[PDB]
Amino acid sequence: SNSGVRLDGYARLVQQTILCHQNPVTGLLPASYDQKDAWVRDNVYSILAVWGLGLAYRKNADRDEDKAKAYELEQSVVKLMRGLLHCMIRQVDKVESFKYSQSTKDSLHAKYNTKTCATVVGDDQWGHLQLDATSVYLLFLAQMTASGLHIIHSLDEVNFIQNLVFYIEAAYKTADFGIWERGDKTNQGISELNASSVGMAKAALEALDELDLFGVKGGPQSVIHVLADEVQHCQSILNSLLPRASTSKEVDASLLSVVSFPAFAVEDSQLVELTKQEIITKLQGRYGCCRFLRDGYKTPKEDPNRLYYEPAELKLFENIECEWPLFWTYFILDGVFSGNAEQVQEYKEALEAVLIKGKNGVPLLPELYSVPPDRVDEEYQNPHTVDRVPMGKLPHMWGQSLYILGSLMAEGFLAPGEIDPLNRRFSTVPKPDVVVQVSILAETEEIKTILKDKGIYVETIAEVYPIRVQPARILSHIYSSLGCNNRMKLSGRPYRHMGVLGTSKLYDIRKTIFTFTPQFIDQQQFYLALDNKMIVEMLRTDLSYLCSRWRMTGQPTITFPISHSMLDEDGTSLNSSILAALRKMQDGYFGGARVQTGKLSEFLTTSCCTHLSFMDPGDFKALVLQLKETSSLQEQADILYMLYTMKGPDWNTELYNERSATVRELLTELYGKVGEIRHWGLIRYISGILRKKVEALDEACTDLLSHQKHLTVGLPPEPREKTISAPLPYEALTQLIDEASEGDMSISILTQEIMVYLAMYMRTQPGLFAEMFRLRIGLIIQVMATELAHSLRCSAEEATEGLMNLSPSAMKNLLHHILSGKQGQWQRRRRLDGALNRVPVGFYQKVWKVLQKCHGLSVEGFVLPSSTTREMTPGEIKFSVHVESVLNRVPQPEYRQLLVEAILVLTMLADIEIHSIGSIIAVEKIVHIANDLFLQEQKTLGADDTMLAKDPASGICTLLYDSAPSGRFGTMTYLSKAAATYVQEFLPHSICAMQ
Amino acid sequence: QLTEEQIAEFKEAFSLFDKDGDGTITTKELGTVMRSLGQNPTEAELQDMINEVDADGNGTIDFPEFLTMMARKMKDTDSEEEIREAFRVFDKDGNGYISAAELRHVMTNLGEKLTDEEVDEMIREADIDGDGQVNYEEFVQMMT
Amino acid sequence: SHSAQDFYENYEPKEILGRGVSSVVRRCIHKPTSQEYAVKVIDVTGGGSFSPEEVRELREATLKEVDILRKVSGHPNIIQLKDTYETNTFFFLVFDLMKRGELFDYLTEKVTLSEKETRKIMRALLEVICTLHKLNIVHRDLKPENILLDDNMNIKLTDFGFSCQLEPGERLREVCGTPSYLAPEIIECSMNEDHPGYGKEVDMWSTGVIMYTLLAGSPPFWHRKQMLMLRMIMSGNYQFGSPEWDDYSDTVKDLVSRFLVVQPQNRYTAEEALAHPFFQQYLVEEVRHFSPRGKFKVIALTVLASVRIYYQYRRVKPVTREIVIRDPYALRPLRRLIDAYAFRIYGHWVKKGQQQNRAALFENTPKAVLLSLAEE
């Protein structure tokens, strides 16, 4: 039959192309060419064609010979997978070290060796960080297991796999070198985040949710357990940065794999079409597509025998990116997968033209086509016109295997439902909504009586004996025993905080039912849970978030017990906000989701239940006297802090002759008394001594950084100020904040609170941060203090004391008011604008054009040479950083605003004329000329000397600051006149202005 | 404040200006009218005039624009210059007086299908002194 | 009107579109057909912060607004209430969706508008006002922020909360609305209790002020002190700036002046306003007959216009870079560019309320010792 002949031909091609270099015993193919190495990614990618051929053979075999062929192919695949797994399992120590902290020194090697599976290079001679390779390996291992190909034999391998799951679960906040093993855009590799790694890691975690590695004959302990919060975090990060591969590359062709056949992890299909169109319009060429703009690999320049590209890529790597037909061969698979046939035919026809025929006349895919060394000038003027020639190795196993698989699938022998048994092709199907279940419990009898008085029926913590409730930290500690082995030196999952997605579902532990309350009602960590309004806001946000995704099975469940702190001052009635929230929860509408209340007995019948199996059994004495006798929280805190600093870090004060009372114990006890008075004047002070830390701070910092913003901790001036341009570990962030805050102590707490509030507000309303590029906590705090002082018309110390006493809700309201933006008026507005340096939305583009028509812009000695225009691009961040640095030399915010206005008016005027100044422009001279003209004009009118005052250290009249921007007497007209005069001063006696 | 008669006269003048009823002056029609009297503005001149009269770049003139243009108070000096130009257009012959033949020729050039009796009656009614000619004072007074 | 279950199982909410003092607008989709709408969700407990009397008053006001809006339904230019759901704690009012925001954003982005769109906007507003007055219903809440814009430049009135029926022979004596849009009659009634009242007619002054703000770009009356603004409004001394109204037709100025009249009786009505020559247009007619004088006048007018067009074209002036050095505000393009750039730079400080307004940007006064004399 025709099918048999086609299968025989494809098998012959595969045997002659890939299987000829399987390297028996080890089972790992060489990494192409005469390199004598085995890259993990290529080995995984090169098996898909063989797997598909075997799958096609199996169904139609019905014969002994076909049975033998299928058995041999399956055995080869299993052998390769086991050989790959051996190398990883030989390096358990590296995984164990990496589980704690994040560093490149404790990372698994990316290039393993041939026979004996040893190491070839050290830890300082290559980029040993690639989270995508392990992710794709795990994804394909999970996919193959469902097919029916055994790859796991011993139970010990299960523990190693479980530990490895924790090795990649932190991919949403970990920097990696990248798929190309070249760090960021330029050379001199610096770790940076990219969308491809997170996209590939997200798919792997979902696949292994409940897939047992023992097939249909497993046991109670054979399934890998994974969480859900990490998947949602990865999805959010991918959605935020989907259009751009990273913060340094405008677009990368590697996103196709993330949004194509392998590891479908994308929603909002419009994004897929947008990115595909962008890639097609930007990177498409004549004989392939480029990886990314300005890559100099295999170029007639760059001195191939040298590395660490010098910062001289002005135009030596422009419009000469060679090619990569792999991005072309991905398109055929992408089109043929879902519903596309005309696109498949078009891409097949396009690819057939760029093929090369070698020995025996069989398909062969070249790596790239290099531009001729002579015809280089023409390309700069006529891009994508000059013919190219092949260059580099072309035994490309990756592209060849992908093309063979695509052709076989298009032939119709195999269907899309066989390669992906997990049904990952239906990720674009919308899900309508979910219904949230909420249960309310009373801490004691009194709370129950109060609730019943107002018509709310609940049950106390008792009377539900068969069910039990406890905090979430207990669950987090319990989870720290999964996949723990002593012989192999594995410590199990590290401790981490638990989100709402984990606490909602029910649990089973030794024939028992357990429920864990949310983490935000914990008063033993911080004081953010002591405010009822904050509790309500967090509850609403949590309800909305839970109702949004809920990608699990079964309705959710939330327990919200009412504690003693939720009562009024008299302790006889719940607060108004709590009652309103409880009433709104009824009637099936609260926040932005439907909420249904009842009793746990009914919810038990319809609710997700998780079965846990791993838990089954296998003179200071005078000062102390003064503290005891003295009263007042101020004196108590002062003496306690002094004792702790001097001699009482852990020493026993001996205050009680019976009980040994340590300084820490007394400080902890003082919280109980402080919490009743709600005195927000020393609760922060005591928190400083204990040095409490906010959980999930790293997540907030990563979220802030992912929005293309630069953080900053520490008040001015430099070098105290820092710059957190990349994510840092929790300990690193805490120590950096402590160092920046110096001994102020309270500054650290204020900074943490401000960061938390900013992270919270960013998600809801990501529109108020426009016109801003750098965030500075010290400047924000100073602005808040100054605003409070002006409002109260008091001294700076009084304003600081008042700010310290503000409740969290008041602080959030003040921050929102400051951000929104809502003599003495115009000067205040200018000062506020200058402090936050809210530049317009297109300042940098205008600055770059003008530079394009002048020699620079000098600002009090410092000069911004125009040569930087060709060394950078307006979209890059280096140019913006340099511009801000040049503009920030002057300390007065009013001067900064005046300079910004002068630059803008100069840019607007430059359009009218058609000429090149060919000279350096000084903004300060223009400003001074405008000020002199305004002074003369006011003097001519007849204003008395009192109105025309002079600044103490600026030389500019105060009225100028108060003058309105526009109008027939505003500062814009004076600035324009001064700029015109200055331009005329350096013009060849002619303007020729025409528009 | 205008009146019904003024509105009717303005509408009639606008209709006469637009030879083919379309609802717009049209650059071609404007050029045809300009050349009818003996003027040959260039295409760039016509485009500039259309842009200046219109508030945007649509390149078309509507009835409201014509009404606004014709309702302007031009004062005396500019009004005097405009009236002098109009008389010169009507005063093609170097005599300084308006006769029946000159008016008939002007109407024919503008595209008016009138009769000799009609033009004679019009001139007789317009004239006051009865000499068969219209002086500057009569022309200026009748302009309103 | 019915149980919340009908809503719950009929409409699926979506992301937010806007926020208010106590209500937020959200997008909803109709199941039995997938049509998009807007829903105004009103909390009538004020999040549990209001005393019961406030909740009852809010419910009564919402019911009155709904029942008044029910009758007016039918006009193409009014908001359409599609569906209503009520509970003990929430009202859900389902409306047509718009697409773009109110006129505030458009005015802020474009700074000032031309006459072409102003004509259509004023025609639609006058038609709606005439229909409302014919229905013996007053609004008293005509503001730029209460008008929605569609993709085809379609505006429909909304925010009928303050609207109330007026029985014949009655005279309202209540004060409400922003001070800048308050007519002199309202202020007089508030100050003196002997004033008979104000009327269907107090809804002209608002239209005139809206026209003036749309054309000039700043409100005719505004000051940093409420008392000074009220005194200036009482005096009624609106004036046109020198280098601001030198490029506008006289008909528009005459219409604006007619709209703003201190005497209530002399104020133009909707029907009278719609008959102004500014809105005059022609389609076709062949019944134009007159005497020889008419033909002579028409020919003279045609010749005069033909002569004057060329002179008007020639009256243009060059860039005059020396003029720019001397005074750049005289040239229209320079002023337009300066205003646009100033608004772009300081466009984040213009919001609702008397504290912040568009007039705060332009400073046409000659800042000097003259500022010493402010008031008594």
PDB file of all heavy atoms in Angstrom, chain C residues 354-369:
ATOM      1  N   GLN C 354     -14.862  73.564  41.324  1.00  0.00           N
ATOM      2  CA  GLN C 354     -14.476  74.961  41.176  1.00  0.00           C
ATOM      3  C   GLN C 354     -13.013  75.202  41.529  1.00  0.00           C
ATOM      4  O   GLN C 354     -12.437  76.199  41.083  1.00  0.00           O
ATOM      5  CB  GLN C 354     -15.372  75.848  42.040  1.00  0.00           C
ATOM      6  CG  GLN C 354     -15.459  77.290  41.570  1.00  0.00           C
ATOM      7  CD  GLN C 354     -14.384  78.166  42.183  1.00  0.00           C
ATOM      8  OE1 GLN C 354     -13.604  77.719  43.022  1.00  0.00           O
ATOM      9  NE2 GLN C 354     -14.338  79.426  41.763  1.00  0.00           N
ATOM     10  N   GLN C 355     -12.403  74.317  42.321  1.00  0.00           N
ATOM     11  CA  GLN C 355     -11.008  74.513  42.705  1.00  0.00           C
ATOM     12  C   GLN C 355     -10.088  74.488  41.491  1.00  0.00           C
ATOM     13  O   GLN C 355      -9.175  75.314  41.378  1.00  0.00           O
ATOM     14  CB  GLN C 355     -10.588  73.446  43.717  1.00  0.00           C
ATOM     15  CG  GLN C 355     -10.525  73.941  45.151  1.00  0.00           C
ATOM     16  CD  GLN C 355      -9.270  74.742  45.438  1.00  0.00           C
ATOM     17  OE1 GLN C 355      -8.629  75.262  44.524  1.00  0.00           O
ATOM     18  NE2 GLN C 355      -8.909  74.844  46.712  1.00  0.00           N
ATOM     19  N   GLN C 356     -10.314  73.552  40.572  1.00  0.00           N
ATOM     20  CA  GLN C 356      -9.500  73.405  39.374  1.00  0.00           C
ATOM     21  C   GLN C 356     -10.390  73.536  38.146  1.00  0.00           C
ATOM     22  O   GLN C 356     -11.457  72.917  38.081  1.00  0.00           O
ATOM     23  CB  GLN C 356      -8.774  72.058  39.368  1.00  0.00           C
ATOM     24  CG  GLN C 356      -8.641  71.426  40.745  1.00  0.00           C
ATOM     25  CD  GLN C 356      -7.729  70.216  40.749  1.00  0.00           C
ATOM     26  OE1 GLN C 356      -7.899  69.293  39.954  1.00  0.00           O
ATOM     27  NE2 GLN C 356      -6.753  70.215  41.649  1.00  0.00           N
ATOM     28  N   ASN C 357      -9.949  74.334  37.178  1.00  0.00           N
ATOM     29  CA  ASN C 357     -10.726  74.574  35.971  1.00  0.00           C
ATOM     30  C   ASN C 357      -9.782  74.937  34.834  1.00  0.00           C
ATOM     31  O   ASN C 357      -8.611  75.262  35.046  1.00  0.00           O
ATOM     32  CB  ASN C 357     -11.767  75.678  36.188  1.00  0.00           C
ATOM     33  CG  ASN C 357     -13.087  75.140  36.702  1.00  0.00           C
ATOM     34  OD1 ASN C 357     -13.345  75.147  37.905  1.00  0.00           O
ATOM     35  ND2 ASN C 357     -13.930  74.669  35.791  1.00  0.00           N
ATOM     36  N   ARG C 358     -10.314  74.875  33.610  1.00  0.00           N
ATOM     37  CA  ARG C 358      -9.511  75.198  32.437  1.00  0.00           C
ATOM     38  C   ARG C 358      -9.034  76.643  32.461  1.00  0.00           C
ATOM     39  O   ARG C 358      -7.924  76.938  32.003  1.00  0.00           O
ATOM     40  CB  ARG C 358     -10.309  74.927  31.163  1.00  0.00           C
ATOM     41  CG  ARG C 358     -10.102  73.542  30.582  1.00  0.00           C
ATOM     42  CD  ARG C 358     -11.382  73.010  29.966  1.00  0.00           C
ATOM     43  NE  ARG C 358     -11.495  71.564  30.114  1.00  0.00           N
ATOM     44  CZ  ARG C 358     -12.527  70.845  29.693  1.00  0.00           C
ATOM     45  NH1 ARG C 358     -13.560  71.408  29.087  1.00  0.00           N
ATOM     46  NH2 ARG C 358     -12.522  69.529  29.882  1.00  0.00           N
ATOM     47  N   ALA C 359      -9.851  77.557  32.987  1.00  0.00           N
ATOM     48  CA  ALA C 359      -9.481  78.966  33.001  1.00  0.00           C
ATOM     49  C   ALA C 359      -8.243  79.232  33.846  1.00  0.00           C
ATOM     50  O   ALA C 359      -7.626  80.292  33.705  1.00  0.00           O
ATOM     51  CB  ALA C 359     -10.649  79.813  33.507  1.00  0.00           C
ATOM     52  N   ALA C 360      -7.868  78.299  34.722  1.00  0.00           N
ATOM     53  CA  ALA C 360      -6.692  78.497  35.561  1.00  0.00           C
ATOM     54  C   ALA C 360      -5.395  78.475  34.764  1.00  0.00           C
ATOM     55  O   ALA C 360      -4.367  78.940  35.268  1.00  0.00           O
ATOM     56  CB  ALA C 360      -6.645  77.434  36.660  1.00  0.00           C
ATOM     57  N   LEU C 361      -5.419  77.951  33.538  1.00  0.00           N
ATOM     58  CA  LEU C 361      -4.199  77.863  32.740  1.00  0.00           C
ATOM     59  C   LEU C 361      -3.881  79.193  32.064  1.00  0.00           C
ATOM     60  O   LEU C 361      -2.818  79.780  32.293  1.00  0.00           O
ATOM     61  CB  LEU C 361      -4.330  76.748  31.700  1.00  0.00           C
ATOM     62  CG  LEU C 361      -3.698  75.406  32.062  1.00  0.00           C
ATOM     63  CD1 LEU C 361      -4.138  74.963  33.446  1.00  0.00           C
ATOM     64  CD2 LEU C 361      -4.047  74.355  31.023  1.00  0.00           C
ATOM     65  N   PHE C 362      -4.790  79.682  31.226  1.00  0.00           N
ATOM     66  CA  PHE C 362      -4.557  80.938  30.528  1.00  0.00           C
ATOM     67  C   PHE C 362      -4.515  82.098  31.515  1.00  0.00           C
ATOM     68  O   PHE C 362      -5.312  82.165  32.454  1.00  0.00           O
ATOM     69  CB  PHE C 362      -5.647  81.177  29.484  1.00  0.00           C
ATOM     70  CG  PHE C 362      -6.061  79.938  28.746  1.00  0.00           C
ATOM     71  CD1 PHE C 362      -7.139  79.185  29.178  1.00  0.00           C
ATOM     72  CD2 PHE C 362      -5.375  79.529  27.617  1.00  0.00           C
ATOM     73  CE1 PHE C 362      -7.521  78.046  28.500  1.00  0.00           C
ATOM     74  CE2 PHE C 362      -5.754  78.391  26.933  1.00  0.00           C
ATOM     75  CZ  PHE C 362      -6.827  77.648  27.376  1.00  0.00           C
ATOM     76  N   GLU C 363      -3.573  83.015  31.297  1.00  0.00           N
ATOM     77  CA  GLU C 363      -3.421  84.214  32.123  1.00  0.00           C
ATOM     78  C   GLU C 363      -3.344  85.416  31.186  1.00  0.00           C
ATOM     79  O   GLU C 363      -2.252  85.853  30.811  1.00  0.00           O
ATOM     80  CB  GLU C 363      -2.191  84.113  33.018  1.00  0.00           C
ATOM     81  CG  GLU C 363      -1.842  85.406  33.733  1.00  0.00           C
ATOM     82  CD  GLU C 363      -0.346  85.612  33.865  1.00  0.00           C
ATOM     83  OE1 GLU C 363       0.240  85.104  34.843  1.00  0.00           O
ATOM     84  OE2 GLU C 363       0.243  86.281  32.990  1.00  0.00           O
ATOM     85  N   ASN C 364      -4.506  85.951  30.812  1.00  0.00           N
ATOM     86  CA  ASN C 364      -4.561  87.107  29.927  1.00  0.00           C
ATOM     87  C   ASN C 364      -4.425  88.431  30.667  1.00  0.00           C
ATOM     88  O   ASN C 364      -4.213  89.460  30.020  1.00  0.00           O
ATOM     89  CB  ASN C 364      -5.868  87.097  29.133  1.00  0.00           C
ATOM     90  CG  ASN C 364      -5.798  86.212  27.906  1.00  0.00           C
ATOM     91  OD1 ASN C 364      -5.045  86.486  26.971  1.00  0.00           O
ATOM     92  ND2 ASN C 364      -6.586  85.144  27.899  1.00  0.00           N
ATOM     93  N   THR C 365      -4.543  88.427  31.988  1.00  0.00           N
ATOM     94  CA  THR C 365      -4.434  89.667  32.741  1.00  0.00           C
ATOM     95  C   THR C 365      -2.987  90.158  32.740  1.00  0.00           C
ATOM     96  O   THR C 365      -2.055  89.350  32.722  1.00  0.00           O
ATOM     97  CB  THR C 365      -4.911  89.468  34.179  1.00  0.00           C
ATOM     98  OG1 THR C 365      -4.951  90.733  34.853  1.00  0.00           O
ATOM     99  CG2 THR C 365      -3.973  88.532  34.928  1.00  0.00           C
ATOM    100  N   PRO C 366      -2.769  91.472  32.756  1.00  0.00           N
ATOM    101  CA  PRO C 366      -1.403  92.021  32.800  1.00  0.00           C
ATOM    102  C   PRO C 366      -0.855  92.076  34.225  1.00  0.00           C
ATOM    103  O   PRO C 366      -0.915  93.086  34.925  1.00  0.00           O
ATOM    104  CB  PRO C 366      -1.583  93.413  32.192  1.00  0.00           C
ATOM    105  CG  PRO C 366      -3.066  93.753  32.390  1.00  0.00           C
ATOM    106  CD  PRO C 366      -3.773  92.531  32.928  1.00  0.00           C
ATOM    107  N   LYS C 367      -0.316  90.941  34.672  1.00  0.00           N
ATOM    108  CA  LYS C 367       0.207  90.816  36.029  1.00  0.00           C
ATOM    109  C   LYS C 367       1.117  91.988  36.368  1.00  0.00           C
ATOM    110  O   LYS C 367       2.191  92.143  35.779  1.00  0.00           O
ATOM    111  CB  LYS C 367       0.956  89.493  36.193  1.00  0.00           C
ATOM    112  CG  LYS C 367       1.926  89.469  37.361  1.00  0.00           C
ATOM    113  CD  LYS C 367       1.305  88.796  38.574  1.00  0.00           C
ATOM    114  CE  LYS C 367       1.384  87.283  38.462  1.00  0.00           C
ATOM    115  NZ  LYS C 367       0.708  86.600  39.602  1.00  0.00           N
ATOM    116  N   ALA C 368       0.689  92.815  37.310  1.00  0.00           N
ATOM    117  CA  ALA C 368       1.404  94.026  37.702  1.00  0.00           C
ATOM    118  C   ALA C 368       0.790  94.514  39.008  1.00  0.00           C
ATOM    119  O   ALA C 368      -0.015  93.812  39.632  1.00  0.00           O
ATOM    120  CB  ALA C 368       1.350  95.086  36.601  1.00  0.00           C
ATOM    121  N   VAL C 369       1.168  95.725  39.427  1.00  0.00           N
ATOM    122  CA  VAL C 369       0.594  96.309  40.633  1.00  0.00           C
ATOM    123  C   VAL C 369      -0.921  96.423  40.532  1.00  0.00           C
ATOM    124  O   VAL C 369      -1.597  96.607  41.550  1.00  0.00           O
ATOM    125  CB  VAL C 369       1.226  97.686  40.918  1.00  0.00           C
ATOM    126  CG1 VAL C 369       2.637  97.513  41.456  1.00  0.00           C
ATOM    127  CG2 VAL C 369       1.228  98.540  39.661  1.00  0.00           C
TER     128      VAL C 369
END
